[PDB]
Design a protein. Sequence first.
Length: 221
Amino acid sequence: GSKISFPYLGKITHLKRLNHDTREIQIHLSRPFNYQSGQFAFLKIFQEGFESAPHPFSISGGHGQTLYFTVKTSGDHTKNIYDNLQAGSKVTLDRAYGHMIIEEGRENQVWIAGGIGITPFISYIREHPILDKQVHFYYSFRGDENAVYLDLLRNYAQKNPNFELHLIDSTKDGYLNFEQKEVPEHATVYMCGPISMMKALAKQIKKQNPKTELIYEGFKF
Ligand SMILES: Cc1cc2nc3c(=O)[nH]c(=O)nc-3n(C[C@H](O)[C@H](O)[C@H](O)COP(=O)(O)OP(=O)(O)OC[C@H]3O[C@@H](n4cnc5c(N)ncnc54)[C@H](O)[C@@H]3O)c2cc1C
Ligand SMILES: [Cl-]
């Protein structure tokens, strides 16, 4: 307990409904905030009609006094977020958490995202406009209407040729599968999506390419 730490006080400045069920929150904080792309944080909302309990969400962009989250409806709080959350509202955050720093991974990196699991990588893309690493990125989503940030990703491919982008619509091709997929020899694979999808892909990637490093963060929708 050798540090006195105060929560990060914030105001919500902008919101955008990216699709039918996912909403992007832009926050201004009272003082600069440390994180590294791939970490999450615990957000507490103070608006009439909202529970103020802390929910974790992956940080999906920002530096300094700007922080972004992208929320997919999955239950009542998130549904309330999509529907009713309002610019002006006060929020606090404790601090960054997680062991998924994309910076610290190898030169070579494979990225796998299922659904709203793309958020941590949007973080990376947003804060590294020119890309240093070598990236194969697999974005899996259930139907075009569950994809987000498409334009941002395509713009990023155009600016960064060392950025290689695969869009899988799982309803077209079936769940992503890495059995007959090879992996760069000295690569780090990062993954984020439904827990069910993580565990299945971990299995497939530790067996085919058992020499690969693999960091993931699951959740349930
Ligand atoms: C590290 C991490 C990062 C994350 N990042 C993100 C992110 O970037 N974006 C994002 O949208 N989410 C993210 N999540 C998930 C998010 O934290 C939760 O999904 C969210 O806080 C749930 O809030 P809720 O009240 O809407 O869900 P709840 O209503 O609490 O329920 C959650 C789930 O449980 C089920 N459920 C609800 N009520 C009941 C009941 N009475 N009985 C049985 N089952 C029930 C629902 O089907 C629902 O899907 C992350 C989670 C983790 C752990
Ligand atoms: Cl799951």
